[PDB]
Design a protein around this nucleic acid. Structure first.
Ligand SMILES: [Mg+2]
Ligand SMILES: [Zn+2]
Length: 516
RNA sequence: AGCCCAGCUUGGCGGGCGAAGGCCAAGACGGAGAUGAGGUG
DNA sequence: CACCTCATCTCCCAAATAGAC
DNA sequence: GTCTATTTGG
């Protein structure tokens, strides 16, 4: 029954962030910073105590940290504008973070908390309390205007998924445009709600249970984006029992048709969508194939890098012009202080010059126009420099997920390697350009998406020990030495004595080992 | 040529260059947080 | 000191209390 | 007296 899921809805791009939401984000950021400082003080005090059996001392110091955490609830929630759901969310995140840090230190790997700086991105939360002996928080309950959670979270127009899938995409997209009234904390003791105009693509099972929701705001290229994520407790799915066995193995051999990333071998024929056959290649028999990634991903990422370099060039030229003009002319006051050539010359970030241009948008001086001459163009190309990158990465991710789906649609047993990921990606990945491909390939992402699909769809997953498999030749079964002979493919064997493919032999070994 | 125009990816139609304006088709979809690395200024 | 990539691991609460009607 | 929003210890 316990299968948590998250459904996300995208707020309309024509929704300026209201002041209430901005203040909630600011308060959450301040709370996290204060918790970080308190934890750092606690860590230093524990170090000092150890620098002096002391468990009572440690226990006493820990309790004082607990009191300050409670006193933060008094400062931010009891006498502030923060919502008690946001505070609980941030406190839980901080507690989990410090627990993970302690676990890491126990092994011997050092770690520490790092401050951050507010930029406008953040998170607000809402928790749907369900006491014992209460009806479930089904989507029909949240869609009701006079329901229990009408002032906490209201998601109108829920249409049954069985009926939802029958509607055409036009009807599904036009009817999915709804408004969600979300509780947004307090304001001088005056509770505030926000009407998010959202677009919904999928709905929830009628038997779900909405545990909570959260609104996430992120700044991409200077433009705010908001997304509402709703968490529900879907009932579990019966695990599959019948289906072909598929073994998946990672690779990174460069190919003329893109970056080849994976090799899969199935014990029975698999059917692949015709929209993936250029990505998920399949041999004649349908039992083995290669997953390659297109070349457009690489071209787009290279174009983004070129854009970043051109931006650097333009910024350096503008810096030189600004320093020259400032030296040759007077300095109008900015930030209540005269402008100095030294400060401008040492500037690196485009943000400083963008802010200066905004301040001097209409100073009337010549350089102001020059400054605007840059600030316009920079704000365009910057968008490109990031947006295309995201799109490119998005494309790759989509492909991976699609591929994962097809496996869970047919496979009855999926096998994955274990030690052929980290160490192999560290050593045989083939340096700055060499390591660039692996970031663009990101085979670990494909592995993770496949694993997630198999877990969600009930497919059993078996992890095969890749130890002493790379050097193994399937046709002969002899361990060839590690003489970097595998820098290419195929590689001559030291057993039978013939060039054998390093990927097909590996996956056939995997299939043999699983069914033994 | 890019990026943007009711979630995301891919396409088609019609538009915008910081402002506009959306319409359709196919597919997939578990998010947040922190830490650790790799790099880049 | 600031930015980006990628890799791992957690987690997803509800009982008690006081109020507006 | 009944749903409801807030505080708080796991
Ligand atoms: Mg869009
Ligand atoms: Zn051999």
């Amino acid at each position: 029954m316990t299968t948590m899921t998250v459904h996300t809805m995208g707020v309309h791009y024509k929704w300026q962030i209201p002041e209430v939401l901005r203040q909630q984000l600011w308060l959450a950021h301040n709370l996290r910073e204060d918790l970080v400082s308190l934890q750092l003080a606690y860590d230093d005090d524990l170090k000092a105590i150890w620098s002096s059996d002391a468990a009572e001392r440690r226990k006493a110091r820990s309790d004082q940290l607990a009191a300050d955490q409670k006193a933060l609830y008094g400062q931010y929630c009891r006498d502030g504008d923060l919502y008690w759901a946001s505070f609980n969310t941030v406190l839980d995140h901080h507690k989990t973070a410090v627990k993970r840090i302690a676990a890491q230190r126990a092994s011997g790997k050092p770690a520490t908390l790092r401050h951050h700086r507010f930029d406008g991105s953040g998170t607000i939360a809402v928790q749907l309390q369900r006491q014992a002996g209460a009806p479930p928080r089904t989507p029909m309950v949240l869609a009701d205007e006079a329901g229990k959670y009408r002032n906490v979270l209201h998601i109108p127009g829920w249409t049954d998924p069985d009926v939802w899938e029958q509607m055409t995409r036009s009807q599904c997209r036009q009817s999915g445009r709804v408004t969600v009234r979300m509780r947004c904390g307090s304001t001088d003791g005056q509770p505030q709600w926000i009407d998010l105009p959202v677009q919904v693509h999928r709905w929830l099972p009628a038997d779900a249970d909405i545990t909570g929701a959260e609104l996430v705001v992120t700044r991409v290229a200077g433009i705010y984006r908001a997304k509402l994520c709703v968490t529900a407790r879907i009932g579990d799915t019966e695990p599959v029992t019948s289906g072909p066995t598929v073994a998946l193995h990672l690779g990174w051999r460069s190919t003329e048709e893109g970056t080849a990333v994976a090799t899969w071998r199935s014990d029975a024929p698999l059917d692949i969508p015709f929209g993936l056959r250029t990505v998920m290649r399949v041999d004649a028999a349908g039992t083995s194939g290669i997953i390659v990634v297109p070349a457009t991903i690489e071209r787009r990422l290279t174009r983004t890098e070129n854009i970043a370099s051109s931006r650097s060039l333009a910024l350096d030229a503008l810096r030189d012009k600004v320093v020259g003009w400032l030296s040759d002319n007077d300095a109008p006051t900015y930030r209540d202080a005269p402008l100095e050539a030294a400060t401008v010359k040492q500037w690196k970030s485009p943000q400083r010059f963008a802010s200066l241009a905004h301040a001097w948008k209409d100073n009337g001086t010549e350089i102001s126009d020059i400054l605007w001459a840059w600030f316009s163009l920079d704000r365009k190309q910057w968008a490109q420099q990031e947006n295309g990158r995201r799109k490119a990465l998005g494309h790759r991710d989509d492909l991976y997920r699609q591929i994962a789906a097809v496996i869970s649609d047919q496979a009855g047993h999926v096998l994955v390697d274990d030690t052929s990921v980290a160490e192999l990606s560290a050593r045989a990945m083939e340096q700055q350009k060499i390591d660039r491909r692996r970031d663009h390939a990101a085979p670990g992402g494909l592995r993770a998406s496949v694993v997630a699909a198999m877990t969600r769809d009930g497919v059993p997953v078996t992890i095969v020990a890749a130890a002493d498999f790379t050097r193994t030749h399937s046709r002969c079964g002899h361990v060839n030495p590690a003489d970097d002979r595998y820098l290419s493919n195929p590689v001559r064997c030291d057993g039978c004595g013939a060039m054998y493919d390093q990927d097909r032999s590996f996956v056939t070994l995997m299939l043999r080992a699983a069914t033994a």
